[PDB]
Symmetry: D2
């Protein structure tokens, strides 16, 4: 149930904040050039191309109730993203896995936002031969779980708008399956949502089709069928878990081109991302979605998603010692 899941998070959260006075990693821990530092003290070289030209890729696994969730899927996506950008994970994947879990155990964080960043390094791409672009930089940090939609808002649903002043960066400019931090369009959508009195922007592809929002995939529900865009979006691990939950309940999920018009004619809407999970949308463009309540299929997806966090096929326990 939703109340039991959030009550456990609130308990573990309070325990974490009580440890902050004696554990300098309780607010987060970062890995910078082989050194573990408190997150809010972490610094990176100004000349790092991940800053100078956002020449990087990244990925965000999570920890819930002391259990890493689908970590191997995120590490595999990071490696695929690195290869698409001609980057290379600077450490063996097995060592990265050991460092990540050790950082979580040192922080004591039971519900964690985990981020890995692989940047081009100190040498820019311009005027460089491929041989001198191999010293890629790696940054990792753990921090308390981040909510794109706060737990209280998940009980009643959120408000969204179809963005009309900004469209998603097309794949011909930037591959949206390569997770990146070049959030120019998404930051614009967030400003438009604030100007229009809503919280979440839904960005189109400029061809009257839905893509994704500012840090989440979009799923529409109409007549017992789930619809989510197949192109122009990140292939989210949460979205993959949504498909797993729907298949277990005999619910069809159509991963295809989704017209904007369907968002106005569907029964339920919810957002999905690692930093938040399953987040219902009960208002669109100032009007309620159907009856303005969290739909029944959304709760089924919501309940199943968090149940997967204790399935040993998708999670493993962390030894905090």
């Amino acid at each position: 149930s939703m109340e039991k899941v959030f009550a456990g998070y609130q308990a573990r959260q309070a325990v974490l904040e009580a440890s902050a006075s004696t554990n300098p990693f309780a607010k987060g821990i970062a890995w910078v050039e082989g050194e573990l530092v408190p997150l809010h003290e972490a610094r990176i070289p100004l000349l790092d191309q991940g800053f100078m030209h956002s020449d990087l890729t990244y990925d965000v696994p999570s920890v819930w109730d002391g259990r890493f969730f689908r970590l191997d899927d995120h590490l595999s996506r990071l490696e695929a993203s690195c290869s698409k950008m001609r980057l290379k994970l600077p450490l063996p994947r097995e060592e990265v896995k050991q460092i990540l879990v050790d950082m979580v155990a040192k922080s004591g964080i039971r519900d964690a936002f985990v981020e890995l960043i692989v940047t081009r390094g100190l040498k820019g791409v311009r005027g460089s031969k491929p041989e001198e672009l191999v010293n890629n930089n790696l940054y990792m940090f753990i921090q308390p779980y981040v909510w794109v939609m706060e737990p209280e808002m998940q009980r009643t649903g959120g408000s969204a708008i179809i963005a009309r002043t900004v469209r998603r960066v097309p794949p011909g400019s930037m591959d949206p399956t390569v997770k990146n931090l070049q959030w120019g369009d998404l930051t614009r959508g967030m400003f438009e949502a604030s100007d229009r009195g809503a919280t979440y922007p839904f960005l189109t592809d400029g061809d009257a089709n839905l893509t994704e929002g500012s840090g989440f995939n979009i799923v529409l529900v109409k007549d017992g069928v789930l619809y989510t865009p197949d192109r122009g979006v990140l292939e989210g691990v949460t979205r993959k878990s949504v498909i797993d939950v729907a298949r277990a309940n005999g619910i069809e999920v159509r991963v295809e081109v989704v017209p904007v018009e369907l968002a106005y004619q569907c029964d339920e809407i919810f957002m999905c991302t690692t930093a938040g999970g399953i987040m219902p949308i009960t208002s669109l463009d100032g009007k309620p979605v159907n009856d303005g309540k969290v739909g029944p299929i959304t709760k089924k997806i919501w309940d199943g998603y968090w149940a997967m966090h204790y399935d040993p096929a998708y999670s493993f326990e962390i030894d905090y010692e």
Copy 2:
């Protein structure tokens, strides 16, 4: 004169190199939270939104022969970029000017690449009211002049391609008049150019029109008339200087939609940006541009652009 301008630069480079053993700022100086540090030692907070989400704007003025070139145009464009992104220059504009001048003077660099970065700060835009987004961060650094085209290549021109695996980010996603560091498409084009045996990628808008390249504007020349794209590109200060020079010489500049086909049927091609100046392109898609030599109008713009660096209306001397 190309040889005269470059010979002066190489001579000043020897002076800078000889000073490096006793000046820790000779390789660059950075301004971080009110502190001046050697550029290669400068560090920024990991949680800065300029890194966490590239939530920033920036601008790049330059120094040549100890003269700041068109600094007030770059400072004004940075302020216009900040307002468009709901950022604000964290220091008064005049105070920023004196810091940059003092930074250049401390470094001893006579030909300088100067960069100013304004990021959102330590708090992200997501789930935030406008009041908690006013603590923007400022980063500035001086570094030796950066060449998108090396001086020796400018004498003969470079090789370019029309990018076919990537197109420019449309203005409906990111305003290209707001200078930003989200170079996803530009970095892809640089890889495609390397894959195809050329140096400079020319990105289209996907609608079969030219836009800009990986850090430079594009100007085509046909029958004595300059053509440069009017939308989907940065309004470069170098491009504005090109128009200034062509204005003084009676050369018509057409800032309009430029179709891709014109790049294959023009007489001269050259790029322009602060990090390099006027850079001729004598080869396109593996084929020569006209006669494969640097064109006469390009040389006219070239000579006029560098003479502008000693015009008091566009520059001022730095007291080292």
Copy 3:
């Protein structure tokens, strides 16, 4: 003041409507291969490439109160469209205008919809040399004045929507300054407007900018300044007349890129085309434009536009004997 012009047309309508029994051309007259036939009896070859592949351009001048309005501008734009499409007006422009006034004369129509069509001919472009594509076909007809907005609606303003299920054909696909009959996107927009309970669709370029609608240009007014898109649209003769009226009245004109958001924050909206003239819009997306009344700048352009039809510099009288 609308009444004088409308009553003139309404009274001239009765003279034409009462002459329907006697006049075989009161409902229209067409020019097909050198012969003149009643409009609703005209026929074209099935193999004409103007039908087989919409391989044509066209233009619509008009007659008002027995005065051809800016006919030479429409003829020049037609010749420009032909050259851009590698077509050629199959008769000297001088013979075309003489044939045109003769057709209006025999029809007796005082307020007429005139349409010229130049098609590729009977031979298709596919697998053909340039020399085999020179026999272009010409089709011309006169028709009673067509209103994209009824005169009664023009006094109160109409309802419009920003199309969300369709966007305008980009110039890189089809040159919108070459007037064509490939209305696939405009027809979809008209269906969307009917679906959403409005009359007129406003199509975007997919990049959150305004373009044009189904057969008209769009003009926005805010703080006494006219705004109309500068690309991706037809350079309409009515729009050029709107700008001309603005020149004579000291109005600032901004022919530039108009973002979609300006339509939701402007003071007045009106559309313009030869088939209807100046056509106000007082409702957008189900909400009133400003105060929902025909704004003062629109009424100013409206009165000036129809006064040009009696200006000898822009019109000339037809001799009906």
Copy 4:
């Protein structure tokens, strides 16, 4: 065996030519308002919206060696196209099939190009209720088989270019799965190919991906795998047959987004459409495709495609009495 197919076609061509003196339908037959006329005498009303605004859909089945090829697949696609455009086939599809067979038998054409056109009718969409737009018009005609690539050129393959002055109309403007005659972009591409010394234009989607050409789908072959675009194109019946032949031969076909770069790195290229069949491309942008010869996998698809014309699951024999 390309000779076996082409020689049989030439023998039937000689028989049809000798009958042209006595048969007025040997050059084609058209169905216009229930009347059968010689194709080159067929006329349509000028005011038909299929001409006035290209407000129509169409489809092209074919006859080979006296056998209709996949006719019901074309009729089903025609019905799906009509429904998407809010049109309706003006006759029962079984009667339409009976009429088509009767026209082919009456013409004596053994290898035929068959075209069916459904237009909006005489009343335009602009300012109309759904009731007044139900009188759709139907045009059908038979004519000798049309070759987008001549049989002799199919032996050595043709030359193509990636169009750089034009891009395909995006689906947000016009649905490419709805076969239409609004060939504005395709005609421009055909002119660019002629300007650049090539025969066939390959149009991109504007996002550095391949779509289709001027009346054909595009298939790339690399390392034994077939690639063809999954969006922005017509879902061709010939393309469907290509997938059928490749599946019967254990050859993988990937219907997915195809980057432009793959066209410059692949082993074989061929086009496919009803009017011509499998058409190899051995030159791209003035350079040979691999060795410049018709590839082995292309010939395998070529042989299987024509063998399908005698498979009872994809063809049926016409009784010419």
